[PDB]
Amino acid sequence: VYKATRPYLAHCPDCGEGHSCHSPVALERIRNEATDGTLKIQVSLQIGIKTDDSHDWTKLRYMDNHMPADAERAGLFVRTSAPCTITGTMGHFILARCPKGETLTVGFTDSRKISHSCTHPFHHDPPVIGREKFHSRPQHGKELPCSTYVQSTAATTEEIEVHMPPDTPDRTLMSQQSGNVKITVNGQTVRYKCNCGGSNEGLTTTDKVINNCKVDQCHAAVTNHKKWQYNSPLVPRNAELGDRKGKIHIPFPLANVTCRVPKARNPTVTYGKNQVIMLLYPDHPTLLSYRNGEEPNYQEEWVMHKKEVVLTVPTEGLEVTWGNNEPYKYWPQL
Amino acid sequence: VYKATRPYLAHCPDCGEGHSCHSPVALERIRNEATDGTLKIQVSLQIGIKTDDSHDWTKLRYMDNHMPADAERAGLFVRTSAPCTITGTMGHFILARCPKGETLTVGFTDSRKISHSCTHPFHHDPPVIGREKFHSRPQHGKELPCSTYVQSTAATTEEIEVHMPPDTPDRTLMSQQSGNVKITVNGQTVRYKCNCGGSNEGLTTTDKVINNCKVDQCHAAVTNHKKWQYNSPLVPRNAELGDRKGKIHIPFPLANVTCRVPKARNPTVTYGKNQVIMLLYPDHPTLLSYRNGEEPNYQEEWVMHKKEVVLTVPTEGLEVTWGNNEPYKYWPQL
Amino acid sequence: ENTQLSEAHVEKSESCKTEFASAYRAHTASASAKLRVLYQGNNITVTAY
Fold this sequence. Notes:
The structure is cut from a larger assembly and holds two copies of chain A and one copy of chain C.
Chain A: E1 10-12, E2 21-23, E3 27-31, E4 39-49, E5 55-64, E6 67-72, E7 77-79, E8 85-97, E9 101-109, E10 115-124, E11 142-149, E12 159-163, E13 174-176, E14 181-183, E15 190-194, E16 203-204, E17 208-210, E18 218-222, E19 229-230, E20 246-249, E21 254-261, E22 268-272, E23 275-280, E24 286-291, E25 299-303, E26 307-312, E27 318-322, E28 328-330
Chain C: E1 33-39, E2 42-48
Antiparallel strand pairs in C: 1-2
PDB class: virus
Keywords: receptor binding, membrane fusion, icosahedral enveloped virus
Entry title: CHIKUNGUNYA E1 E2 ENVELOPE GLYCOPROTEINS FITTED IN SEMLIKI FOREST VIRUS cryo-EM MAP
């Protein structure tokens, strides 16, 4: 599919130090529907594909001003408040596990070095899967339903809209001959507009001259028609053609899977008159929930350290859930 | 100005792992008067100047024990809780955009590697410019007055105090001849003190001998008189001369500039009897402020997520400001 | 028998010309207002103390 598509330059509000630029690593959309915390990031460049369209996981292709160029995959980075763990890369898409943050940055290195990054404001604080706030994923634990973007290269379900490109502006395409405008195409498709009479349209594959016109009165931009590009709101629509659209399948779709969650240790239990006393010893943050009959009166609290809890056990009964453990049931003696 | 001045070694409370040292990257003063969050950091070394006094942006000069040595500018780093973005470097000064932190570290690499860093306790949490807590700087937005330290190399307004150096201790200057003390100057200015009679003062430009004295009873230190040094409270004053001071202009002065910002979306507004109801949907933290007549009763709150606000509209009128948007004005119907 | 003399004082910062607050004594406010007047079917502007 990459023989028809190409990497592109698009608007980025922060290319470094809060300054806007026409970025070759521009952020399109950040997807966070995966309950496991995995982020599906869409970028303007294409990872795992070379300029000759061949697939190479160690390579990356980005739009280098006028034409696409090759870059290293090792130089690609994703960061929020601190660096992210990249779990998968293919074309315009990146899969990443990020720590808590308020911004999202995606960057890379060219050939002559020069780091290019794109920062977008994004609130990232993924919700807890289960009832325990843990750091590392365990081998064994309670099987809970969760969603993730699959690591697989294959593109069969999800899709994006594509169309013929817009116009990379380039003033070097025009020159004064001798007091008129000369547009030298250089084997490309160039869209030109001049503030002069006669001819000022196209989209041309050949050299054009505008007599008795000034170079400042004209506008030149790389043309096309032979390639496809993502239907980006950061790139203008092709004026000549109408609402002509194409569509391509995308890697890493969202799917229902299973997430392994840890547990804890049964607290030392002591009983009293219509009440239960628990000495909680958590090794990590653990959710403690309880309910009564007709009036359940649900209450919950995240237990961080050593805490003694005194709970009233009514005649109808009391159900207590301590982390990922099965609920404990308590009843008073007649 | 760098032909007269020199990099120096000064006290640092933390050179790594909480241990104090005579640092070639010692922190003097951290300035945070810039409302845009830019930090003006003063260090003991000199960036952009070689040992031969020539200006070279890729080079850095630091005091290597007895004499100054050259180091790479690429190896220079600034960090708080995470790495900082260096916006400008010249002489003793560094400009940096830092994330939230409780300490400030400035470091570099020598020639034979060996990383030298200096950590000082510094509370960094820059205040919000405007009414919206954003991550990246936009191209377009509301023009608000802010201060920054200018990126320009030129030194014309701000200044620092300079004077002739203090003393670098060096025990290799003294030797036993044959059971007495021999102080070999080696074309330098050496300050010596001996726990023996006769002569034990100076500040000498020539070789000195102390008869019937032990090498352990003496103290030697390399001065100077030919060079200038910043009037540092971490380096001792020259005892021989009085209150002799010099002054030099410094780069990156503070100046009044303009900071660009963004805006939020207009909330869904519903009206009632002498009251206004707003359904706020913020994408990021947004400042919500309001005021009434004779008694304005100013109130403010940072809105983080979905919140419904019920505000009383008096006969005199109510002014409501939602983030970077122009204030909304409300009046009751007669 | 070695002594250290520590010296310190508080002058205006380099920022004082750029970043500063002014303390003023406000007295007797002078009221001014340009009154748009619909005079002879036309709008006339009057600026007076």
